[PDB]
């Protein structure tokens, strides 16, 4: 589950 870059992840 990848979402907003400053808190949630980009790597999935």
């Amino acid at each position: 589950g990848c979402c907003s870059d400053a808190r949630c992840a980009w790597r999935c």
Side-chain angles (χ1 to χ4, degrees):
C2 284
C3 47
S4 70
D5 200 85
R7 292 297 181 279
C8 175
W10 63 80
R11 295 184 187 96
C12 276

